[PDB]
Design a protein around this nucleic acid. Sequence first.
RNA 1: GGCACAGAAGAUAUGGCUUCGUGCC
Lengths: 123, 121
Amino acid sequence: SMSKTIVLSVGEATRTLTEIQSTADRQIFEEKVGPLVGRLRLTASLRQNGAKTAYRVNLKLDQADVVDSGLPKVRYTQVWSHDVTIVANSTEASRKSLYDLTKSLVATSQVEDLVVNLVPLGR
Amino acid sequence: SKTIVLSVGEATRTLTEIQSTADRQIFEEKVGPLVGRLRLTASLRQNGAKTAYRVNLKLDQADVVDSGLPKVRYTQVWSHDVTIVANSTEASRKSLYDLTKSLVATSQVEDLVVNLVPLGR
RNA sequence: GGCACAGAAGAUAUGGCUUCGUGCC
């Protein structure tokens, strides 16, 4: 209850990423299940540019593939990172619109097909 | 012609392909002035080793104020970089897809992008 | 020379870029 988390729902299941590191710049959430190697991990950071005219949100989801013939071992890692440029004097509506448009984009079957089957966008 | 349709509430935005190369495509919302049209750029490439693919997706949103003559004030962007291992299971790829679908839909992520509120509750 | 790197920093984004690091021919 008291560790901070982000909870991801995939259909009927939910997957809780527990915060394992927090610094002024950066945050790391990891899923507390399974082998200690290759746990699902979310790295997130917020940063201003030198001019203080824009922000950069970085989010990075690392999904490792662990095989366990004896003791566990990460075979490979697949990653989906995000890089969001927010302008400091932007209207809130402009940021909500970017968010709304991306939530829709990622939710499309076309983007599912691209990532899962390498099928080009456009129908 | 080729399109992708995005749905916000009861509204839709139709992005239409205006360009393609062997490994890149550019979609715009072909509505209104040419100034500041919503744009999606999509790329697919291989590893140096040919053991992985990188998918790049980038949404550029200009802020246009139309007081007679349109002008871009600023542009905000949300880009994605996806690393897909070549020999991987469809299940593992679909899982990463679903986890990210869910990640972006969280109100924590909205709070981050819209209000700069750090993640974790 | 050429190439690799989910190495680091910068960039409101042809961000298919720049610089720096490390490694392979």
